[PDB]
Design a protein around this ligand. Structure first.
Ligand SMILES: CO[C@@H]1C[C@H](C(=O)Nc2ccc(-n3ccccc3=O)cc2F)N(C(=O)Nc2ccc(Cl)cc2)C1
Ligand SMILES: [Ca+2]
Lengths: 51, 234
């Protein structure tokens, strides 16, 4: 269920073949566990900056 | 912005400021990528010529992080009309690429359905800008931000003396003295999800500011993702 805490996805969540498929915004790659979204470079979109 | 708090260092990196040839700010905008800025259509008629400023938090000076970028193309939604203020959205292609850094980074564009079922359903959104701090005040000199609650759609129509279209959405407080204002127009309305901020609205209009029984009216970004995606390829 994408309805349950977002199917444990970091960002986008879809329900294909009656399951769960995570994806990310441009600039991020889908992590190995297929849930987390890893930033492609410094200053990824959507993150407040620290440096 | 009326109420809210000051944008601390690195807090609102996607904020963009449209400045007139006199270098005075007049509208907000949101950084989408190194070349594109998202703003309000009604902000266009508001200036003969204009540039975009990024990395600024205090207009009274230059701390070194600020950067000016000239506009190469102004993509105004053709269906926008001041009579209804419907389709209040515009995309700007900059002449030179933005350099991401402290206080300078784009907000994320979400996917339609996901944003509508997950972002728009959130408890609150965040609006920011250098706009007036009061209805009859002056252009604020400090970048501000404000957590604005998403408002019931019906409760939104019952309070508007104007037509609220599907391309619009209410955010704000019924009586608490906080809201966006003039000058914040075109600015970002972002929603946070697991510490990632997605652009959800464009500051559009309001009958005054922070008025009891009134809300802030924002352009629904989800209703224009396709149009935005098409605008960024050319
Ligand atoms: C009285 O208002 C001052 C003047 C300025 C203004 O001109 N507002 C304004 C614009 C368009 C319409 N309008 C709507 C539908 C059809 C026709 C039409 O004319 C009505 C309006 F009142 N304003 C403002 O922009 N405040 C503002 C508040 C909250 C947020 Cl989020 C963003 C901005 C406050
Ligand atoms: Ca400054």
């Amino acid at each position: 269920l994408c309805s349950l805490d977002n199917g444990d996805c970091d960002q986008f969540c879809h329900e294909e073949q009656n399951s769960v498929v995570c994806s990310c915004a441009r600039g991020y790659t889908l992590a190995d566990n297929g849930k987390a979204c890893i930033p492609t470079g410094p200053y990824p979109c959507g993150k407040q900056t620290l440096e | 912005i009326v109420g809210g708090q000051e944008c601390k260092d690195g807090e609102c990196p996607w904020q963009a400021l449209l400045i007139n040839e006199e270098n005075e700010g007049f509208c907000g905008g949101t950084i989408l990528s190194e070349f594109y800025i998202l703003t309000a259509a009604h902000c266009l008629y508001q200036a003969k010529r204009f540039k975009v400023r990024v990395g600024d938090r205090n207009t009274e000076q230059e701390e070194g992080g600020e950067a000016v970028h000239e506009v190469e193309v102004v993509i105004k939604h053709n269906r926008f009309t001041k009579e209804t203020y419907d389709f209040d959205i515009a995309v700007l292609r900059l002449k030179t690429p933005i350099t991401f850094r402290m206080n300078v980074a784009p907000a994320c564009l979400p996917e339609r359905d996901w944003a509508e079922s997950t972002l728009m359903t959130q408890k609150t959104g965040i609006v920011s800008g250098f706009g007036r701090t009061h209805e009859k005040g002056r252009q604020s000199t400090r970048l501000k931000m404000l957590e604005v609650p998403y408002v019931d759609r019906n409760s939104c129509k019952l309070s508007s003396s104007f037509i609220i279209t599907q391309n619009m959405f209410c955010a704000g407080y019924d009586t608490k003295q906080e809201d966006a204002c003039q000058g914040d127009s075109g600015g970002p309305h972002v929603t946070r999800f697991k510490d990632t901020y997605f652009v959800t609205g464009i500051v559009s209009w309001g009958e005054g500011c922070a008025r009891k029984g009134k809300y802030g009216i924002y352009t629904k970004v989800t209703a224009f993702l396709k149009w935005i995606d098409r605008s960024m390829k050319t």
